[PDB]
Amino acid sequence: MTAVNYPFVDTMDKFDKITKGLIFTMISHELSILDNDGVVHSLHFSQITSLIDTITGKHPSLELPPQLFLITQYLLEDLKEVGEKGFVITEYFIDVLPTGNKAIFRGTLAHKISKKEFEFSLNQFSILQQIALSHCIANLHEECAGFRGTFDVEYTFHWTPFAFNVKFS
Amino acid sequence: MTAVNYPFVDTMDKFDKITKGLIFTMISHELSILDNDGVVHSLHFSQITSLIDTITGKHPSLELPPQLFLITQYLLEDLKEVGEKGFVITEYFIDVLPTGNKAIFRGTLAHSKKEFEFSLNQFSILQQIALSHCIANLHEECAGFRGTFDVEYTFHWTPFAFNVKFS
Numbered sequence: 001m002t003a004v005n006y007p008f009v010d011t012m013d014k015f016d017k018i019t020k021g022l023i024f025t026m027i028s029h030e031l032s033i034l035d036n037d038g039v040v041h042s043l044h045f046s047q048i049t050s051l052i053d054t055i056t057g058k059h060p061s062l063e064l065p066p067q068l069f070l071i072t073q074y075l076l077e078d079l080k081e082v083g084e085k086g087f088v089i090t091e092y093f094i095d096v097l098p099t100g101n102k103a104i105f106r107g108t109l110a111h112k113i114s115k116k117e118f119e120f121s122l123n124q125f126s127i128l129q130q131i132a133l134s135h136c137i138a139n140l141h142e143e144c145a146g147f148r149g150t151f152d153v154e155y156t157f158h159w160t161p162f163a164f165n166v167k168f169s
Numbered sequence: 170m171t172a173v174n175y176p177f178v179d180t181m182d183k184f185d186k187i188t189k190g191l192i193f194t195m196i197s198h199e200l201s202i203l204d205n206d207g208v209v210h211s212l213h214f215s216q217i218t219s220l221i222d223t224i225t226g227k228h229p230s231l232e233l234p235p236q237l238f239l240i241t242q243y244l245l246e247d248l249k250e251v252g253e254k255g256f257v258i259t260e261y262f263i264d265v266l267p268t269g270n271k272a273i274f275r276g277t278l279a280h281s282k283k284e285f286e287f288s289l290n291q292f293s294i295l296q297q298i299a300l301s302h303c304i305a306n307l308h309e310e311c312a313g314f315r316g317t318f319d320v321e322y323t324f325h326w327t328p329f330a331f332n333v334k335f336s
Binding site: 001002003004005006007009011012014015016017018019020021023025026027029031032033034035036037039040041043045047048049050051052053055056073074075076104119120121122123124125126127128129131149151152 | 170172173174175178180183184186189190191192194195196200201202203204206208209210217218220221222224244245273290293294296298316318
């Protein structure tokens with residue numbers, strides 16, 4: 001019986017003490033998180049995954065273009081409907097406002113010439129949401145890859161089919 | 170200017186408070202976890218992902234066949250080397266022993282025939298859960314044997330049958 005030890009013993013020991021604490025037989029699938037203030041927030045495994053995946057950028061939703069990301073995240077049914085009527089976003093601005101946790105999603109729809117303009121004040125645009133949207137901007141082109149994990153910064157992302165830019169305030 | 174509110178406000182609130190605590194600008198990428206007794210364990214994002222994904226079954230290493238899973242997990246170089254010599258595992262047993270945190274990975278290699286046996290130590294509840302996901306991913310019939318820990322069983326595998334024998 002060739003005795004073989006696990007390579008990451010110490011790292012494994014941490015997992016054991018945690019997993020052993022989740023036993024109640026089954027695993028609770030829910031981990032408590034302690035913040036700076038000292039408050040425990042009970043989050044399910046799926047929520048912890050989502051929080052980490054968004055901050056790291058591995059979340060599948062962060063591959064979406066910034067506009068499509070906002071549309072999927074804020075349930076912008078009106079902009080889906082105009083897409084089904086032959087309209088496409090020809091230009092859009094995302095104004096991120098850290099104070100107030102808002103995001104102004106404004107732009108111009110065109111048939112391609114009929115043109116409709118839109119404007120949405122996306123509330124609750126927290127730090128997490130600011131990080132996520134920076135991942136969408138960075139995944140559009142390698143030119144914007146440096147703008148990744150940017151939060152608590154007021155900026156406007158201007159997009160056209162010919163140029164994309166981030167202007168700071 | 171139409172005002173659109175986020176659907177999951179409260180779920181987001183929890184994230185925000187937590188995310189505020191990781192700010193040092195950049196994020197700490199490390200979360201502090203509290204267990205039942207009241208002990209805090211500060212684990213990195215990568216570790217927490219690995220722990221959660223292992224318990225849920227989403228980890229990529231759990232798709233591997235159970236023997237190839239063990240080989241990769243414990244760095245069983247000897248079984249790779251004999252593989253390079255035209256030998257293949259014709260039969261293998263995995264005896265899970267919860268008391269003592271061991272897994273006996275025994276079996277037979279054939280091209281002459283060399284049999285093998287490994288005592289995989291530190292086979293904890295997390296690893297017992299992982300192995301149950303590999304057994305379940307082998308066939309749909311064995312899917313019920315998922316998330317099994319603290320149970321003494323032997324997994325017998327042949328090319329023509331697979332079985333879980335409980336003790």
